[PDB]
Design a protein around this ligand. Structure first.
Ligand code: NUM
Lengths: 412, 412
């Protein structure tokens, strides 16, 4: 029968820092990680800024010889995974290696690498494609390379559900443990889509903020002057562990994962329905899964992408799920500061949701100068809000009408 | 306790045919779907052949306008999925749509789209990138488009575990139903990596057969003259359904899905361990999941890719798991005929495993002229073998050392 699941380890690369503590300090201080992009020439692009990981040293984790073969999204996924496993204190042994698995996902995966090999192919010929093109680019190789480096022989897989990837990855990994398929899972996501095709492709869809002259103010969830999401890079990883397994080894437990919801909108390939019907169905699934009264929800880490339709849909969904209690909880978008890490969004935001529980503070939605029509909830505008948080919820919505909700609570 | 899961609908595009019955007819006749790749300059490539889908008409499924928005791998996934849902007779209603979900995956995703948008980007700059580039290329859009078209509001996700994708998708969809998160799931995979990038990428790793003079003899699993896998395109979709749900509406039930196993090799990025230790753990996990003794297995659809190390690892794993029963079962690689559909391999091979149960026949391993050292199992060389089959396994072993096994049983 269904086992309980706790968080014993966390790891992160974000536009705010090269680990969890440094990222979280930036979150609580309302600091933006968004800046003009330096790694390529974007003069022909309508968007020239994003959330870059600054000063990442892969040789903190891997040999330069191995790193050369891997896309940045794999390098970032391994770094966050390595941090989370170390943070857990867990020792991998012959006695437990078959019971530890990994589910690290990505929305787009190795687009930089595929673009660079596509350039080699077109300009030179197929004989210049890297021998490592496939294993260095395809999305399942975070899970693959992590298992090879740590000796994890448990369930080994990868989700790809666009902007919902990190949330689904964590939820489904919790279900693996819940149902006895594993005792430990390393789960989350990673993304590095800041190449020509990434910035160009989201640009062609007119999905991105074009506030090139003020990048720190571009990401402005629920602000009436928002004009699209900000593209950001990085990784989140959590060590999920069966409760009795955690208790037995004396693990430090950050929080319990009590609820997971998924729902499809079945509405539109790219647009969320204005009323948030799919997001509402997903949160209600997650709250029922957790055995909660919705009035127990203290904090919501919103998807909050800073799109016109997405941000208002989320207000509508929260009002419909929580009714009068919608006015008592706090809801913030850390994407105000980090931008949109796409497949990694749900992973870093799950970490921010757990840290909201550890520290009893709602992170701010920075840049919320003029809340839009109907955006009249506690959106923690401008400044972190210390407050009682027993139950935190983290939402993600994605292309294909794909929704995920995670429910965390304090563990005593 | 756990709900029972049955197969009530199947759909396919393969190198043998544009549906299940035409593909299966080719399989039992020992026909090859492999041929030189057309309408593509492969002059500078060491491999010039593969398994193409021949005569696919997307306008049987989509308007020209919707099909223009979608990579071939998505078109193929949608074709298989629509076929599977039609084949099932299922009526989607307001009363059941929240209980019907989708998990259609891909190993490599939108390489053909990425290739064509790279052309535009390099030649003319980013403003010629298609608006639909991102939603038209990301792996979760088969699940996304299918859910939107049919109004499916159940779990909506996509796996990407390289050559294991189709097996994991079906297995994890079966878990969703067994543990009551859904009553119906459309599950499987789709793949179209016959671009410069797939042929070039696998070619750079010298992973492909280069037998250009005799494409139909290239894929020769367990034959001493094999020289790597054959790249193939297509899709498989299954309608998975809770047993009481299927019986209440009078569904035609092909077979029961009794067992699902996962494991990680934790060994190498592209090569399996010589003894197939990971594949052995995975099959043992799948049989434990089914409550079955290795002795009860009659038929194995092998991964059987025609790689030197892969084929020999699978013989070792089967001998290890099945002891004195290893010769009694029949094991064949339908990849001898279809080539390797990568992420769709597990989906089309689950369908072939189900049909081996319906028709009491083991598909052939064609081209097995000279079994290699230790390849002395019943590999159904050359010709289909009518025989008793109560229990059929389907194995997938992919990059990152990610393993999947499905156990199907006759239903009466
Ligand atoms: O290597 C790292 N972590 C893995 C720890 C580990 C845990 C269990 C085990 O059995 C083996 C290794 C790392 C490196 C730099 C920064 C953070 N973490």
């Amino acid at each position: 029968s269904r086992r309980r699941v706790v968080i014993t380890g966390m790891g992160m690369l974000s536009p705010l820092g090269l680990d969890v503590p440094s990222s979280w300090e930036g979150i609580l201080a309302g600091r933006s990680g968004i800046a003009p992009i330096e790694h390529m020439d974007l003069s022909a692009y309508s968007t020239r800024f994003g959330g870059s990981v600054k000063g990442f040293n892969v040789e903190e984790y891997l040999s330069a010889k191995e790193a050369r073969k891997l896309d940045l999204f794999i390098q970032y996924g391994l770094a966050a995974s390595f941090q989370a496993v170390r943070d857990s204190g867990l020792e991998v042994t012959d006695a437990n290696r078959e019971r530890i698995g990994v589910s690290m996902g990505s929305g787009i995966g190795g687009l930089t690498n595929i673009e660079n090999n596509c350039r080699s192919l077109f300009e030179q010929g197929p004989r210049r494609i890297s021998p490592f093109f496939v294993p260095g680019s395809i999305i399942n190789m975070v899970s693959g390379f992590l298992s090879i480096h740590l000796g994890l022989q448990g369930p080994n897989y990868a989700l790809t559900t666009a902007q919902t990837t990190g949330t689904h990855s964590i939820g489904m990994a919790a279900r693996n443990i819940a149902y006895g398929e594993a005792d430990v899972m390393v789960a989350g996501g990673s993304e590095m889509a800041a190449c020509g095709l990434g910035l160009g492709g989201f640009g062609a869809a007119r999905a991105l903020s074009t506030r090139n002259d003020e990048p720190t103010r571009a990401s402005r969830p629920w602000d009436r002057d928002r004009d699209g999401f900000v593209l950001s890079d990085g990784s989140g990883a959590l060590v999920l562990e069966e409760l009795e397994h955690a208790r037995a080894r004396g693990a430090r437990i950050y929080a319990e994962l009590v609820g997971f919801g998924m729902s499809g909108d079945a509405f539109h390939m790219t647009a969320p329905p204005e009323d948030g019907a799919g997001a509402a169905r997903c949160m209600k699934n997650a709250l029922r899964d957790a055995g909660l009264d919705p009035r127990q929800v203290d904090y919501i880490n919103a998807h909050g992408t800073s799109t016109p339709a997405g941000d208002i849909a989320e207000i509508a969904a929260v009002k419909s799920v929580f009714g009068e209690h919608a006015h008592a909880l706090s809801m913030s978008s850390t994407k105000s500061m980090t931008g949109h890490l796409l497949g990694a969004a749900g992973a870093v935001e799950a970490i921010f949701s757990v840290l909201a529980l550890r520290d009893q503070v709602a992170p701010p939605t920075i840049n919320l100068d003029n809340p839009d029509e109907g955006c009249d909830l506690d959106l923690v505008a401008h400044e972190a809000k210390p407050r009682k948080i027993d139950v935190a919820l983290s939402n993600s919505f994605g292309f294909g009408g794909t929704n995920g909700t995670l429910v965390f609570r304090r563990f005593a």
